[PDB]
RNA sequence: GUUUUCGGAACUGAGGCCAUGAUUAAGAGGGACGGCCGGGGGCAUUCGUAUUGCGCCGCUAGAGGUGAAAUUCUUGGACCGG
């Protein structure tokens, strides 16, 4: 819990997996490399409700915390990367998506670089529904 | 008896002559040739993320899924990140 970085210097920086799908949202920070993970809390550790695990308020109060765990650390800054669940599967990010980094934003901490790495396929496998879709 | 001119039948050589004999080249067709063209076909080769699984590392208690849930996975470490 000691970063040895002068404050008013400059900016220690993280970087946070913001992967949001239609079911649930996840807040995962990380170091610059992504193989030492400082926190991560979901959105459904945070409601008790399985509907409502991605609703963006779910995700607005588990950015809070993340922000507030990562504050003491020693972090300052994040870089975010946004992602759906990919694949296959739906390619656009779900609800919990945009209210959790303004969240964290109005936490106070510092933004960097923002990106998509939404796990696009070159070319699927057979995704999952009959032929005649999920009707 | 015979040979022929004699009329007929057949063959065989040299001619002479013909305005000496081949319509056109289909906005029909075939074929050739020319430079191209094309997710046409075949065989071989190469690349791409993704998905699933496994190994290791990190941190963790939920993760999945739905109209809502449950079956299912999970401190024997799932999901998530490398």
């Not at 920086?13 to 979901?42: P, Q, W, Y």
């Not at 995700?59 to 975010?80: F, N, S, Y």
């Not at 945009?98 to 670089?113: E, F, N, T």
Request: proline share 4%; with cysteine.
């Amino acid at each position: 819990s000691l970063g040895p970085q002068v404050a008013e210097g400059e900016n220690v920086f993280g970087v946070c997996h913001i992967f949001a799908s239609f079911n649930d949202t996840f807040v995962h920070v990380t170091d610059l490399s992504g193989k030492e993970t400082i926190c991560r809390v979901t959105g459904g550790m945070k409601v008790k409700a399985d509907r409502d695990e991605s609703s963006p308020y779910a995700a607005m109060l588990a950015a809070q915390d993340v922000a507030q765990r990562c504050k003491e650390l020693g972090i300052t800054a994040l870089h975010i990367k946004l992602r759906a669940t990919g694949g296959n599967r739906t390619k656009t990010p779900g609800p919990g998506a945009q209210s959790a980094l303004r969240a964290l934003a109005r936490s106070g901490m510092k933004i960097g670089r923002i990106e998509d790495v939404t796990p696009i396929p070159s070319d699927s496998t057979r995704r999952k529904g009959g032929r005649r879709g999920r009707r």
